[PDB]
Amino acid sequence: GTIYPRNPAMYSEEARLKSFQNWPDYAHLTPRELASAGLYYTGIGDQVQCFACGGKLKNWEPGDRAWSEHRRHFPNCFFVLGR
Amino acid sequence: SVPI
Ligand SMILES: [Zn+2]
């Protein structure tokens, strides 16, 4: 293909959801919302990564939404642009 | 949030 995901295994939303098993208790966004936006947990802090573009986000703040943060920071991601 |  002409595009290729940074993490093919995390292609699956269910695989992304499972990655949040040890998502920290202070991290306010839900695994549901994050996984739906393409994001999976890297295992460090509140840091997540997109399976598609490979961008990483951390230090979530109140009012942040997963999709709007993903699109603001990585607007050329194919998952963002395929939504 | 911020990018890494
Ligand atoms: Zn992305």
Residue in A with minimal Cα distance to B3: A57
State the total domains in chain A.
Answer: 1
Residue in A with minimal Cα distance to B4: A56
- Domain span at residue A12? 1-83
Instruction: Tell me the two tokens of residue A21.
Output: 């098993």
Query: One-letter amino acid identity for A43?
Result: G
Tokens 């998952």, residue located: A79
Q: What is the experimental resolution, given in Å to one decimal place?
A: 1.4
Method used for this model? X-ray
Q: How many Å apart are CA A3 and CA A53, to the nearest integer?
A: 10
Sheet with A39-41: strands ordered across: A39-41, A48-50, A56-58, B2-3
Chains A, B: CB contacts within 8 A come to 21
CATH number, domain of A28, equals 1.10.1170.10
Degrees (nearest 5) of the Cα angle A74, A65, A77?
20
